[PDB]
Curated annotation (Swiss-Prot), chain B:
Changing E61K: Rare variant detected in cases of Moyamoya disease in East Asian populations. Monomer. Interacts with UBE2L3/UBCH7; UBE2L3/UBCH7 is the most efficient ubiquitin-conjugating enzyme E2 for the ubiquitin ligase activity. Interacts with UBE2N/UBC13; promoting 'Lys-63'-linked ubiquitination of target proteins. It comes from Homo sapiens. The chain holds residues 936 to 1909 of 5207 of the full protein. This is E3 ubiquitin-protein ligase RNF213. The lineage of its organism: Eukaryota, Metazoa, Chordata, Craniata, Vertebrata. Autoubiquitinated. The gene is RNF213. There is a cross-link at K210 (Glycyl lysine isopeptide (Lys-Gly) (interchain with G-Cter in SUMO2)). Atypical E3 ubiquitin ligase that can catalyze ubiquitination of both proteins and lipids, and which is involved in various processes, such as lipid metabolism, angiogenesis and cell-autonomous immunity. Acts as a key immune sensor by catalyzing ubiquitination of the lipid A moiety of bacterial lipopolysaccharide (LPS) via its RZ-type zinc-finger: restricts the proliferation of cytosolic bacteria, such as Salmonella, by generating the bacterial ubiquitin coat through the ubiquitination of LPS. Belongs to the AAA ATPase family.
Length: 718, 939
């Protein structure tokens, strides 16, 4: 009677959970379900909330039964008794004024095992609240609300008020094969074809679960494997090919280093004869652009090192208008709190409605709001799907556009240590680092670039500089980012050593774009006028525009591409930031191709909204070219710069109906010595990293350096 | 190159680095070229005659070996299309190619063979070495060794092939790479035709082995499918099949072809019995047949053959002959092909699989059987459609005779006896009824179904609307009623689309509409469902939500759901108020901040007051609602901005309150979300010296500026307090709240008993007369002069500055200078400190303590001991002077996780600061339990 999705495992576990949930809710028995993630508990919760719309039910059965309103509370080690009390009271308020024979309000506690032994011991309130609904106040009939507690962590039965407690263990091979058959049941030819594969995949899954150190893979991974293989066989209309099994296995059971999923699953099968490779970029793509049908795949978790995954994602797949929205924690002084969660979930919702893909940055603290949405258990109305989102005590059903996708970028180690196991199970996990994109020869080029860097720094007295002190913004991954950006700009061109040389030269050019002129002069001097040194001096002083920001701007306006309507540049300097008068000069130079460049100081902004207001004020002008300049003094700050960058990217992506051309410059004032805070640049991706020693046009010296490099000081006065 | 040698070989001393530098620049100029271009110039041009051992030659040789390494890593075959003039230099290049292309596991026989087969340069190396001797003579010794490895590998491979002793992985790689293998071997053998015969022999034998493996795999998979019910035990066969063949020598796994004896019939690793050979062959032929898979219900393999295989094959044979003859009964078609509905291409594949057995050929009858099964399935679907049409007739209330459909129902009731017939003998009348229902697909049946079950919704729609014209008015009312949640608002659109789609049947229909006229009135629905795939679901959703739809007409004209309307009003009229809590309430944002929502002409609702939690509830609501793709976000954004702005102001107030500041104790601020008569901010300090301050403009600019000044004043106040604490010793006995309490009370007559008690810790048994005498000396005439000065000056200073923020900074400065001018009933920290000093002097004798031995004066001493020892030790310290009164908090602090930095700070300040009258001791006990932050700040 209830309209389940066809790919849903109509397994015994969900059957019993629904039956129990219905009977207990209808009769206000407290019911506690404990099991490992994927054990049909939260699914049963949504199904029972949807089916038990008494008069608005889908079947005459539930129309005979009571109408259920759920008030949900997500338990944590930091949850207070007042939270549980207020939840029960809100349910009572819902039950107030109604026939308790046709309506019931239920309290649902999620992850109750987390609250078990917290120092505040809030679950104590459970005992009284389940009996009558009151801790000190006088009883009433409407205060006795129904109750279901769902948890993955074990529970104390004495606190359950002697309710009904159902604890499930990890299923066995027969149960996994029955779940798989249930998933495939929608078609019998496909189900029969895949049947052989079900046993092997179950044995492999139990192997993976016993091998791994921490619970990292669970039942959702197995179920999605069965789903993806069923879909593959269904579209092919033939037995699934080894490559499809490999691809499914890799999509689901990748993300952990000590795991060799495909080797385990292949050990159970002879398909290995093909065993073609699939890269994490192919898998991430297949997730985001999954090849009319309910072939909806889990939301992505990209595990990365040093926020690297964002460069790869922005560059490779989000080249065009598919550019998603970055959901991040603000780095502005007066904005980190509750209100940031409110705005963020508003944006998540808007992207679900509109179908815009989302990137989840340092926002794991948003999971309690997204916990049920990640399950991707959908209510339906008119074909459109709705999923629950909450911000505080309020949970609401919100519309999901079939095109919506969610990518969480997090550090691998933060995920392994802190991330809750059920969150890890709800997401499809892949590891992405530049090393995983670069081929063997591209990695070799990176090694060569690091050697070239050290030579540049020291030699191809002798203070023995460090690369960070010369290539401003240099870091362990700078050369890799450079090579990635170079080859991405080159395209997918096939490998040839000619490409190797061109790529090396491009990489050198970029690093040189980030170099000090002092360093290039040194490099010539210490090479006694070497060929390399003169080539690099030519490129820096003649084929590049470090003489000021105006020269760089002019070169960028003339030479920049026409496809890239948004062009992003990051600038580091040791000089004093530009004032409004310098922007007036830039306007006089630029007028005729763009309006006055807008200069903004990130430090001057206390709130992300105040910043966004001015970004929009600029972007709303009708000029066909716009130059926005953002200024910051590196004194902490990297968070401000990053948040401002993300915001500008998002707002440009939003103001994109126009084909106008936006040039973004981020200007960071550094110190040659420093203050311990090591500026880290070469952020790669959409950005161009350029060092300018001095942004001004040098009125006191009308010369571009490298003219004095062959003139004496006496001649200056002649 | 001549200039390079000339310049390099100049005998400059080595210490200077002439040669190395010049040669580095030359190597640089070389590397700028393409690796293959470098190798081409090296070999083709005869520049080398200059002396093959000079430094330039060795530098270029180095560069060329690096080029060859790059090419080998790139897998670029450089010898293809290559040319050369100097045999020595070409031999050097060739040796570099051989050595660099070699695998890292230089001795792995299989990886050597893989290297030889996969890499093309090997072909060229063998070709060159075969053509003329001069290349081989010029080649190095490492390359000659690697060539000897290649020769040995190839000759072993050939011996294995010819004899049959080859592993299956080698044979597989050789088959995949037969061309390179045979060319390389031909070159070698000319250097030093049966191998083609051998590779063919082994390919045939390997295909046989793989055929048998795949037959056994299919049998194993079948038994694994029936695993859930029947288990088999064939340990020997499962072990044999499980072994990885690549390591296994062919002649052991299978008899190999050699005319040494007759061409023996091949025998495999399995040695399958004849029964199991037949069974596995057939099961392999039907491995993809969905009809042979099910086809059945611990066993041994002979019992598996007898029970499972023979029945299945016999039934499959009989079914295939039934299909050929057409004698297949409708019951058999219904049981077997229940799944192939809408999958007739798969049915065609299945039936050709049945044909593969090569009995009942003609491989064309299946086209007819496929069409007959299409007809049977369409017939049953037509039956379902007819039943749905009858349900729609009774639901909508039609009267047109549909007796003809009874024909299909006449079949549907006598489903069992009629089904004893064949596929072609069914009848022509049912065929005609399907011809009629042809234009209704399962989706169209689903639409009709969504209409049928909903008679109450249909009657209500017809009573309420009566026409599609009215729907729009209804929908407006519904949008007011919706509920601002996506499902709730979307219910309206679901209903609108449902009614616009099913309008023909609901409204246009005449009850006397007959069968075909009903099909055309249905064709309009056909076009609607073609344009909308979820229209039946929208209908059903509307019918499930009928009670709300009923409410729409009479009631929901009034609801006027108001969640964003509330935010809009707050933005227009709303007023946020920040003030010190009344009733001695604890200081918190909730108590400080609250919203007033008035009423305006044209809206005479109740002037409400909202609590911070209610505003946060409204916010959460706005956010979960606000996904509507509309500009309405501006109001939510204004709302959120002002909320956050005011919240920041509130927390600044709380900070100043926590710091002990006094101005912001009677201070009330009204922030008008939109101006009232030109006023956006209003501040009143509750002081007769400070008149009401009001400013207009953007509320958020004023608020940010005011917050920044409050925060600057906070840092300035923290400095001012630290300063007065260094200037006055006794202030440190107290916290900020105690200082505020005392400032207020000591001016009273009489003070509170709590305050005199708090003073007792400085002057034991303190009384009103003690404080009255302590007031002397501190109330200098200079203080009254300052008070008069500030009370007269402030009006002028405030008139000279115009913005609220400058007037407020003036007030803040002057309050730090002379607070008595603003708050006369409070003692400034200086007069308070003086009164405390006077009391302390009027008290008993100073307290003189001495540290025990082992503890150094002027030093921060530290004692480390078991928990139980901590407390007695602290006591011995004071024991040293047992005649001295007992310590108190002034001297001893017992630390807890809840111990705040203010306590440790005040202890340290009491110890180190000057002004004290005696040599007390100061103890900080159980510090390990402190938080890291507090101990850090204390240090």
């Amino acid at each position: 009677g209830v309209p389940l999705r066809k790919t849903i495992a109509k397994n015994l576990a969900l059957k019993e959970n629904v039956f129990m949930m219905v009977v207990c809710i209808e009769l206000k028995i407290p019911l506690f379900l404990v099991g490992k993630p994927g054990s049909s508990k939260s699914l049963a919760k949504t199904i029972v909330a949807d089916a038990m719309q008494g008069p608005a039910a889908y079947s005459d059965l539930f129309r005979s039964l009571k109408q259920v309103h759920l008030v949900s509370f997500q338990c944590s080690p930091h949850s207070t008794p007042q939270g549980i009390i207020s939840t029960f009271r809100q349910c009572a308020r819902f039950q107030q004024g109604k026939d308790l024979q046709q309506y019931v309000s239920v309290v649902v506690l999620d992850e109750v095992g987390l609250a078990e032994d917290s120092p505040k011991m809030p679950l104590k309130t459970l005992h009284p609240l389940l009996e009558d609904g009151c801790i000190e106040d006088d009883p009433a009939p409407h205060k006795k609300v129904g109750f279901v507690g769902i948890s993955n962590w074990a529970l104390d039965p004495a606190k359950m008020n002697r309710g009904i407690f159902v604890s499930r263990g990890s299923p066995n091979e027969t149960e996994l094969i029955e779940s798989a058959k249930g998933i495939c049941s929608s078609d019998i030819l496909v189900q029969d074809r895949v049947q052989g594969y079900f046993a092997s995949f179950a044995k492999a899954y139990e192997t993976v679960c016993k091998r791994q150190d921490k619970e990292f893979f669970g039942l959702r991974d197995y179920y999605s494997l069965i789903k993806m293989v069923f879909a593959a066989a269904k579209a092919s209309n033939r037995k699934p090919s080894p490559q499809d099994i490999a691809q499914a296995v890799l999509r689901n059971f990748s993300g952990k280093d000590d795991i060799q999923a495909l080797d385990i699953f292949l050990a159970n099968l002879p398909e290995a004869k093909c065993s073609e490779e699939v890269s994490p970029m192919q898998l991430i793509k297949q997730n985001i652009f999954g090849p009319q049908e309910d072939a909806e795949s889990r939301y992505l978790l990209v595990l990365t090192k040093n926020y690297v995954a964002l460069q790869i994602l922005q560059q490779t797949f989000f080249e065009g208008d598919q550019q998603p929205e970055i959901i991040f924690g603000s780095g502005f002084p007066k904005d980190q709190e509750y209100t940031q969660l409110c705005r963020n979930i508003n944006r998540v919702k808007i992207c679900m409605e509109t179908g815009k893909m989302v990137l989840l940055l340092n926002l794991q603290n948003l999971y309690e709001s997204l916990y049920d949405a990640l399950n991707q258990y959908y209510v339906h109305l008119g074909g459109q799907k709705y999923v629950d989102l909450g911000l505080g005590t309020h949970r609401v059903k919100c519309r999901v556009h079939p095109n919506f996708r969610l990518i969480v970028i997090e550090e691998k180690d933060v995920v392994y240590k802190h991330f809750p196991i059920p969150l890890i199970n709800r997401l499809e996990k892949h590891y992405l680092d530049i090393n995983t994109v670069l081929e063997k020869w591209q990695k070799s080029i990176v090694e060569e670039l690091c050697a070239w860097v050290e030579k540049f720094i020291n030699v191809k007295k002798r203070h023995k500089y460090s690369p960070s002190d010369v290539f401003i913004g240099y870091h362990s991954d700078a050369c890799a980012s450079v090579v990635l950006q170079v080859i991405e700009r080159q395209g997918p061109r096939a490998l040839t050593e000619e490409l190797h040389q061109k790529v090396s030269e491009e990489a050198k050019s970029i690093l040189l774009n980030c170099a000090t002129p002092d360093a290039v002069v040194r490099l010539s001097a210490y090479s006694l006028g070497g060929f390399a040194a003169e080539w690099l001096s030519q490129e820096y002083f003649h084929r590049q525009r470090h003489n000021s920001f105006a020269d760089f701007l002019q070169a960028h306006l003339h030479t920049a591409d026409l496809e890239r309507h948004a062009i992003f540049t990051e600038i580091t300097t040791f000089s004093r930031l530009l004032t409004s008068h310098d922007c007036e000069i830039l306007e006089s130079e630029v007028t005729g191709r763009a309006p006055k460049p807008t200069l903004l100081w990130l430090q001057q902004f206390d709130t992300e909204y105040s910043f966004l207001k001015e970004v929009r004020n600029c972007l709303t002008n009708t000029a066909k070219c716009k130059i926005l300049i953002f200024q910051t003094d590196f004194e902490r700050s990297a968070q401000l710069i990053a948040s401002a960058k993300y915001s500008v990217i998002n707002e440009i992506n939003k103001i994109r109906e126009n084909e106008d051309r936006i040039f973004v410059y981020f200007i960071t004032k550094l110190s040659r010595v420093g203050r311990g805070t090591a500026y880290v640049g070469f952020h790669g991706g959409l950005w161009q990293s350029v060092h300018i020693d001095d942004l001004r046009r040098s009125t006191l010296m009308v010369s571009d350096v490298t003219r004095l490099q062959h003139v004496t000081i006496s001649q200056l006065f002649a | 190159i001549e200039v390079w040698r000339r310049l390099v070989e100049i005998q400059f001393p080595a210490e200077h680095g002439w040669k190395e530098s010049l040669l580095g620049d030359m190597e640089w100029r070389l590397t700028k070229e393409e690796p293959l271009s470098q190798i081409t110039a090296y070999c083709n041009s005869c520049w080398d005659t200059k002396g093959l051992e000079d430094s330039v030659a060795k530098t270029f040789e180095k560069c060329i070996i690096e080029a060859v390494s790059s090419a080998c890593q790139s897998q670029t075959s450089i010898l293809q299309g290559f040319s050369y003039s100097d045999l020595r230099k070409f031999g050097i290049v060739l040796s570099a190619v051989i050595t660099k292309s070699w695998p890292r596991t230089a001795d792995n026989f299989n990886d050597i063979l893989k290297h030889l087969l996969t890499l093309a340069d090997v072909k060229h190396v063998f070709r060159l070495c075969g053509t003329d001797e001069k290349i081989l003579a010029n080649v190095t010794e490492d390359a000659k060794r690697l060539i000897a490895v290649a020769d040995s590998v190839l000759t072993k491979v050939v011996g294995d092939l010819l004899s049959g002793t080859i592993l299956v992985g080698q044979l597989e790689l050789i088959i995949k790479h037969k061309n390179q293998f045979l060319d390389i071997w031909q070159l070698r053998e000319k250097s030093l035709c049966a191998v083609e015969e051998a590779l063919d022999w082994r390919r045939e034998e390997l295909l046989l082995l793989k055929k048998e493996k795949r037959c056994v795999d299919s049998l194993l998979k079948m038994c694994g499918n029936v695993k859930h019910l029947i288990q088999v035990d064939f340990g020997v066969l499962a072990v044999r099949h499980s072994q990885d063949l690549s390591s296994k020598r062919l002649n052991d796994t299978v008899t190999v072809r050699l005319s040494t004896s007759s061409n023996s019939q091949r025998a495999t690793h399995y040695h399958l019995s004849s029964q199991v050979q037949e069974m596995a062959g057939k099961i392999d032929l039907l491995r993809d047949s969905h009809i042979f898979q099910l086809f059945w219900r611990i066993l041994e393999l002979e019992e598996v053959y007898d029970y499972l295989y023979q029945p299945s094959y016999r039934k499959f044979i009989k079914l295939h002959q039934d299909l050929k003859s057409g004698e297949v009964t409708l019951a058999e078609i219904d049981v077997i092909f229940k799944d192939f509905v809408n999958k007739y291409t798969d049915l065609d594949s299945e039936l050709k699989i049945m044909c593969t057995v090569d009995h009942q050929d003609q491989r064309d009858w299946i086209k007819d059987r496929v069409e007959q099964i299409k007809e049977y399935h369409h017939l049953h679907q037509a039956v379902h459609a007819a039943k749905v049409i009858l349900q729609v007739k009774e639901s909508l209330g039609l009267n047109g005779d549909f007796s003809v459909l009874n024909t299909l129902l006449n079949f549907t009731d006598n489903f069992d006896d009629f089904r004893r017939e064949t596929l072609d003998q069914i009848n022509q009348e049912l065929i005609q009824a399907k011809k009629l229902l042809q234009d209704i697909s399962e989706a169209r049946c689903k639409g009709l179904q969504a209409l049928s079950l909903r008679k109450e919704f249909i009657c209500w729609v017809r009573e309420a609307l009566g026409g599609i014209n009215e729907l729009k008015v209804f929908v407006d009312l519904a949008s007011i009623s919706a509920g601002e949640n996506d499902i709730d608002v979307d219910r309206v659109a679901c209903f609108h689309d449902a009614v616009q789609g099913y309008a023909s049947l609901l409204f246009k229909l005449d009850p006397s509409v007959d069968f075909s006229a009903f099909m055309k009135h249905l064709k309009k629905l056909w076009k609607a469902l073609d344009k909308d795939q979820y229209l039946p679901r929208k209908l059903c959703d509307s019918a499930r939500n009928l009670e709300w739809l009923k409410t729409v007409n009479e009631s929901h004209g009034s609801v006027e759901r108001s969640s964003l309307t509330l935010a809009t009003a707050i933005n227009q009229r709303g007023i946020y108020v920040i003030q010190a809590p009344k009733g001695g309430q604890k200081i918190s944002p909730d108590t400080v901040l609250h919203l007033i929502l008035p009423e305006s002409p044209g809206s005479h609702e109740e002037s409400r007051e909202y609590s911070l939690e209610e505003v946060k509830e409204l916010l959460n609501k706005l956010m979960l609602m606000s996904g509507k793709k509309d500009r309405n976000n501006t109001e939510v954004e204004r709302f959120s901005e002002v909320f956050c702005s005011v919240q920041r102001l509130s927390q600044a107030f709380i900070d100043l309150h926590s710091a002990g500041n006094m101005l912001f104790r009677t201070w009330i601020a009204m922030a008008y979300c939109s101006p009232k008569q030109g006023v956006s901010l209003q501040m009143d300090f509750g002081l007769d010296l400070v008149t009401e301050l009001k400013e207009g403009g953007d509320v958020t600019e004023l608020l940010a500026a005011l917050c920044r000044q409050m925060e600057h004043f906070l840092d300035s106040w923290k400095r001012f307090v630290t300063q007065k604490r260094m200037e006055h010793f006794y202030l440190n006995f107290y916290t900020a709240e105690q200082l505020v309490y005392l400032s207020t009370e000591l001016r009273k007559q009489p003070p509170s008993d709590a305050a005199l008690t708090m003073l007792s810790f400085i002057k034991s048994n303190c009384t009103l007369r003690d404080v009255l005498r302590a007031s002397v000396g501190c109330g200098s005439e200079a203080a009254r002069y300052r008070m008069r000065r500030v009370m007269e000056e402030l009006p002028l200073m405030l008139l000279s500055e115009f913005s609220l923020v400058d007037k407020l900074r003036i007030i803040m400065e002057q309050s730090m200078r002379c607070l008595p001018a603003f708050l006369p009933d409070c003692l400034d920290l200086e007069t308070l400190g003086h009164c405390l000093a006077h009391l302390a002097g009027m008290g008993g004798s100073p307290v003189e303590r001495c540290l025990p031995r082992g503890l150094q004066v002027g030093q921060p001493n530290l004692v480390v001991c078991g928990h139980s020892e901590v407390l007695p030790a602290a006591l011995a310290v004071y024991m040293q002077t047992p005649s001295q009164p007992l310590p108190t908090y002034d001297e001893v602090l017992l630390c807890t996780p809840a111990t705040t930095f203010e306590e440790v700070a005040l202890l340290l300040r009491r110890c180190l600061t000057l002004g004290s009258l005696g040599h007390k001791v100061y103890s900080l006990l159980f510090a390990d339990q402190l938080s890291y932050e507090v101990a850090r700040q204390a240090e």
